[PDB]
Design a protein around this nucleic acid. Structure first.
Ligand SMILES: [Zn+2]
Length: 461
RNA sequence: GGAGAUGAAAGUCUCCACUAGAGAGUCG
RNA sequence: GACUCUCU
């Protein structure tokens, strides 16, 4: 991904889009009870904590582009994946505007407590003024579709969230790319059925973990990924995507039988325009965070990437022996023979991808005893060993509990953290629960009982 | 909670990141 | 079926 040009909104006619510049985050009653090192991200140009210029750090994630056209490896990789998807029999027909706006069994409705994007978020128009869950009215939507057209620019906001100390000093806040409801509606109308399929089939045919429930999915993974595991991390996956991968995605979409009209929509996301405050900018490459389909598409693209990386790096790779699962950039994959990722990373750089080792180390072996996916590890149950615990590390659960965007929901926050923490064992969970109790607010909380968490987990099976 | 508008005030009104997934809670 | 929270 690479920024092509920046022009003032005076020159491009774009309305100003401003976001919030002060964090909803404030220290919690458990702030000094647990340890942690994170703080709210830098949201403002003149934050004291800053050690560099803010915006230059904000947009450094667009590292640039390498390949624009698929080579022979990326073609064969698209084709292998594309063929693997055919057994799913995806409905490539256009879904109805009622279904796209208001949902199906396998596709939630358009979120209505959330912004409608350019240009509504500047005209004071909310989604709620155009859509109505109870009416299922597609009347006002089709009017505004033909008022503002399609390909409206993405509204850029800084994400309000906890980041490590470094990323605060160095200015490395995340940006969200808020789509226009007009594009979300169309994207949902063109690929909604593919969405349905992908949500209805987390696993190694889709290669998509989207829709999975870690409590039960974790026990299938060691059967779905047999043999030697490999994994790795990307530095800036979304923004590093060179235009070639959108070309690759187009290869997969056609092979599974999408209309050319449908496939044309992919350039609409390889090449995007954006408004940040009072400037308009152009981005060639890079997956916009906030568009209808980002996760699935990043997940598809990843499937193309691993296949290509494999067959351009090693000789005699049988892609039929690859199993893999992607959640956007997150990956777990297995092959009958160990795959050296030091060499994949080398192939990766050729393709504009920066890959680091998975254990956050500077050397690249991955096994179940140390593999992680969706931030959780894999821990076989001490009683029934074929049942696998996802283990969210207690370090990350400590980071969350120390802050809050509204204390009115402390009770709710702590329960959700306990549903995550208990998989680390009785001894760790009671260490957690008792330190919550160590504070006057903690003694007023309803806290789930470990044996009830365990018992509820086992009835799942 | 923060910001604004208005107003002596009371109040009133307006704003406070996108796409998805998962789990939970509350109510019907 | 709504509304909300926390995670990823
Ligand atoms: Zn452009």
């Amino acid at each position: 991904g690479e920024i092509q040009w920046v022009k003032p909104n005076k020159e491009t006619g774009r309305l100003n889009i401003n976001g919030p510049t002060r964090t909803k985050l404030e220290p919690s009653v458990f702030h000094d009870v647990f340890e942690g090192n994170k703080e709210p991200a830098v949201l403002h140009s003149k934050d004291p904590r800053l050690e560099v210029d803010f915006e230059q750090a904000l947009f450094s994630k667009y590292v640039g582009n390498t390949l624009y056209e698929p080579d022979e490896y990326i073609k064969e990789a698209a084709l292998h994946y594309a063929n693997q998807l055919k057994q799913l029999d995806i409905d490539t027909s256009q879904m109805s505007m009622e279904e796209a706006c208001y949902g199906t069994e396998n596709l939630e409705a358009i979120d209505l407590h959330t912004s409608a994007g350019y240009p509504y978020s500047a005209l004071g128009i909310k989604k709620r003024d155009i859509l109505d869950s109870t009416t299922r009215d597609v009347s006002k939507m089709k009017f505004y579709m033909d008022k503002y057209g399609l390909d409206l620019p993405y509204s850029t906001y800084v994400k309000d969230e906890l980041r490590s100390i470094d990323k605060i000093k160095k200015g490395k806040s995340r940006l969200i790319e808020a789509s226009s409801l007009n594009d979300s509606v169309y994207l949902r109308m063109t690929f909604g059925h593919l969405y349905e399929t992908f949500h209805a089939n987390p696993g190694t045919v889709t290669g998509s973990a989207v829709g999975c429930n870690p409590d039960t999915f974790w026990s299938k993974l060691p059967i779905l990924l047999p043999g030697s595991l490999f994994a790795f991390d990307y530095s800036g996956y979304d923004a590093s995507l060179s235009p070639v991968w959108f070309r690759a995605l187009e290869l997969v979409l056609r092979e599974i039988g999408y209309s050319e009209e449908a496939v044309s929509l992919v350039e609409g996301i390889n090449h995007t325009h954006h408004v940040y405050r009072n400037k308009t900018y152009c981005v060639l490459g890079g997956m916009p965070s906030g568009m209808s389909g980002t996760s699935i598409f990043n997940s598809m693209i990843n499937n193309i990437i691993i296949r290509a990386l494999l067959i351009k790096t090693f000789k005699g790779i049988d892609l039929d022996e690859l199993n893999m699962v992607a959640y956007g950039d997150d990956v777990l994959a297995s092959y009958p023979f160990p795959i050296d990722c030091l060499e994949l990373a080398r192939t990766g750089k050729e393709y504009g991808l920066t890959m680091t080792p998975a254990d956050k180390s500077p050397c690249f072996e991955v096994n179940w005893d140390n593999a992680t996916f969706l931030k959780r590890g894999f821990l076989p149950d001490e009683q029934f060993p074929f049942l696998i615990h996802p283990t969210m590390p207690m370090k990350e659960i400590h980071e969350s509990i120390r802050w809050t965007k509204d204390a009115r929901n402390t009770q709710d926050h702590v329960r959700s953290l306990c549903l995550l923490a208990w998989h680390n064992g009785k001894q760790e969970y009671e260490k957690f629960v008792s330190a919550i109790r160590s504070v006057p607010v903690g003694k007023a909380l309803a806290i789930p009982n470990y044996e009830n968490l365990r018992r509820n987990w086992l009835e799942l099976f």
